[PDB]
Amino acid sequence: MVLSEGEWQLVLHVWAKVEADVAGHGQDILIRLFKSHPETLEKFDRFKHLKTEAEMKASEDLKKHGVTVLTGLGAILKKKGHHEAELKPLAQSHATKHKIPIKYLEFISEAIIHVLHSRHPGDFGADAQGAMNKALELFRKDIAAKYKELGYQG
């Protein structure tokens, strides 16, 4: 998997917009994820009992997690592929501590793309979506590699 410098800039350009409202993007992304694939919500003992979008939007725990996710992802994306240092801890943690299967990472990747398109339709077009798709695919591929190394078949 490889992105052109132009494509990385498309990824970083939209991320700058994400950073203007990290909490809001995080809430939208997690709500999209939980509504699309309800089983993923079971992984959060602090707010797995949330049902309605209203409850999800009012949840401090959900909001905080969205910030954690986007803050971490932003750090990785800015590395433009050379994210080994930032990725190792995330991968190890997800495999052993949280036990998050690769399919769940695919689900949240879909949610991220959808929310970025919904909130930034004027600039997050086919080119940017394709670039972000490649970036997240690289992200997942590298996490999967670390998973395998640890023997985790998530």
The footprint of ligand CZM (CB under 6 A) covers 40, 43, 68-69, 72-73, 90, 94, 98, 100, 104-105, 108
DSSP state of 11: H
For tokens 């993923």, the residue is 40
Taken in order 53, 112, 73, 13, the sign of the CA dihedral is negative
Tell me whether residue 4 or residue 141 sits nearer to ligand CZM (CB atom): 141
Query: Is 49 labelled as part of a ligand binding site?
Result: no
Tell me whether residue 8 or residue 47 sits nearer to ligand CZM (CB atom): 47
Q: From the CB of 122, what's the least distance to ligand CZM, in Å?
A: 26
Q: From the CB of 4, what's the least distance to ligand CZM, in Å?
A: 23
3-state secondary structure of 130: helix
3-state secondary structure of 22: helix
Q: From the CB of 37, what's the least distance to ligand CZM, in Å?
A: 8
Tell me whether residue 36 or residue 68 sits nearer to ligand CZM (CB atom): 68
3-state secondary structure of 68: helix
